[PDB]
Amino acid sequence: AAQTNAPWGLARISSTSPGTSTYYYDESAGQGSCVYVIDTGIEASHPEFEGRAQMVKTYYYSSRDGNGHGTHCAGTVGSRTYGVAKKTQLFGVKVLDDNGSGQYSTIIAGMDFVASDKNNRNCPKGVVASLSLGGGYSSSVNSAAARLQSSGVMVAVAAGNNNADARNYSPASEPSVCTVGASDRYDRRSSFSNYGSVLDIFGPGTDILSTWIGGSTRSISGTSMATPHVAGLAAYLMTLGKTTAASACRYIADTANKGDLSNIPFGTVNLLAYNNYQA
């Protein structure tokens, strides 16, 4: 399948070259997979989600996304226009308040929630969690992410936006999950993107158009934007039967575009998420 005039990031993940604007992908499009978006919520009523998104958990007075951040990330995972996996099932878990903030204890509960809740859902092709969040190092946060991964969920987490080594951030620094850095449309490391040996992969993170609350759209930047590219890619690849929740981060690194990014610090992988789709 081909989506013309796609957001640059979608075109990038199906391309061996930057600078193109069509997104190419197998029409299965992540059908039968599930992606949990652990964030500020999802505006499920957005036309872009086509009834495939729903809130399943909140820790605040509402499950609504009063921020936009979670809706944007969800949109990059699986919205019809802005999403990688356009037929996946999206599940919202609101661990961040409408200011974009969350206590680690709440974030940990949300991860353990997903590890269990997936058993209440139909996801024959597998389960992914997208975590565009984090703060300073916490062994407790990392272990929660490790449990979620161990339970059979492909965990994708943001490297962070400090232009620093992601070893000092959580859940970014948890080795067993998939830690995602950010690149821009000219294949440069995003200026804000964390780096380090704990990174597994890069995804499009600078100037990413996706859904927003109020049934709108906007372009914003962050490793928060790169992460759902990889989460969506995982769901897509798992639906194709090419990999599993436990092996998908590795499969994505195996099949990534290699050595194409600039300003990658020595010791950080130079790998860009790629779906290797061949019509």
* Domain count within the chain: 1
Task: Identify how the structure was determined.
Answer: X-ray
User: Can you tell me the distance from the alpha carbon of 231 to that of 270, in angstroms, rounded to the nearest whole number?
Assistant: 19
Catalytic residue flag (residue 65): no
Selecting among 15, 46, 65, 69, the annotated active-site residue is: 69
State the residue range of the domain holding 50: 1-279
Residue 61: count other Cβ atoms within 10 Å of its Cβ.
8
Task: Give the bridge partners for 54, in sequence order.
Answer: 91
Selecting among 14, 15, 33, 39, the annotated active-site residue is: 39
Phi, psi of 250, rounded to the nearest 5 degrees: -65, -40
User: What is the CATH number for 138?
Assistant: 3.40.50.200
Catalytic residue flag (residue 229): no
Show binding-site residues for Ca(2+).
16, 175, 177, 200, 260
Catalytic residue flag (residue 45): no
Residue 241: count other Cβ atoms within 10 Å of its Cβ.
10
Type of residue at 147: R
